[PDB]
Amino acid sequence: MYGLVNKAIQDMISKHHGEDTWEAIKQKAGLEDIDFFVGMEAYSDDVTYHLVGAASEVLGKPAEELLIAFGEYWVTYTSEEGYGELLASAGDSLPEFMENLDNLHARVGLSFPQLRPPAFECQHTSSKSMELHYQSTRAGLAPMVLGLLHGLGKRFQTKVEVTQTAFRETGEDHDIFSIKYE
């Protein structure tokens, strides 16, 4: 994925656990070569997973867990580090922002074509409930979506309960989440 995701992981770990740890996780992930990640450069999705795997061991936490944390962090990180207005242009509420993703990503891919964006459909069951379909060319990032949602919940001071009712990794076509929100 574009370096942007890898810098984010690095920024989070470093900020929460110091460079010593980050350097460690980097060496273990077998990436002690890469002196630094380039934001607008396309890397092999495997580069990210390796960082997730190494961070899992080095921190004694499970991948799925860190992915949740990274989900939340991403929403904050992007607004700060050069993507505030892009995010601001996505809406003034969770439900709206989620409908804008497909648009938002298209909007982004234009600048960066090697972008392989996921699809996000939404059936608004009610005015406080919606069903989210997450479709991706990657595997094992459902947990990050979980974090992403909560991050959006904080961004719009909205209480939100997210629970996953279908999992790709277990055969099912694609991940599906059920969402309740204040």
Ligand X SMILES: O=C(O)CCCCN(CCc1cc(F)ccc1OCc1ccc(-c2ccc(C(F)(F)F)cc2)cc1)Cc1ccc(C(=O)O)cc1
116 annotated as ligand-binding: yes
Is residue 136 a known part of a binding site? yes
Cα–Cα distance list, 79 to 97, 107, 136 (Å): 14, 16, 23
Instruction: Please indicate if the annotation marks 77 as binding a ligand.
Output: no
Q: Whole-number minimum distance, CB 115 to ligand X, in Å? A: 4
Residue 159 CB neighbour total at 10 angstroms: 8
Q: What is the 3-state secondary structure (H, E, C) of 46-97?
A: HHHHHHHHHHHHHHCCCHHHHHHHHHHHHHHHHHHHHHHHHHHCCCCCHHHH
Of 4 and 29, CB closest to ligand X: 4
Task: Give the length of the chain.
Answer: 182
Is the Cβ of residue 21 or residue 100 nearer to ligand X in the bound state? 100
Rounded least distance, CB 170 to ligand X, Å: 17
In the complex, least distance from residue 54 CB atom to ligand X, rounded to whole angstroms: 19
3-state percent breakdown (helix, strand, coil) of the chain, nearest 5: 55, 15, 30
| Site for ligand X, rule CB under 6 A | 1-2, 4-5, 39-40, 75, 78, 83, 101, 108, 112, 115-118, 136, 138, 141, 144, 148, 152
Closest approach of ligand X to the CB of residue 108, in Å: 5
Would the annotation count 22 as a binding residue? Answer: no
Q: Which residues are annotated as a binding site for heme b?
A: 2, 74, 105, 116, 134, 136, 138
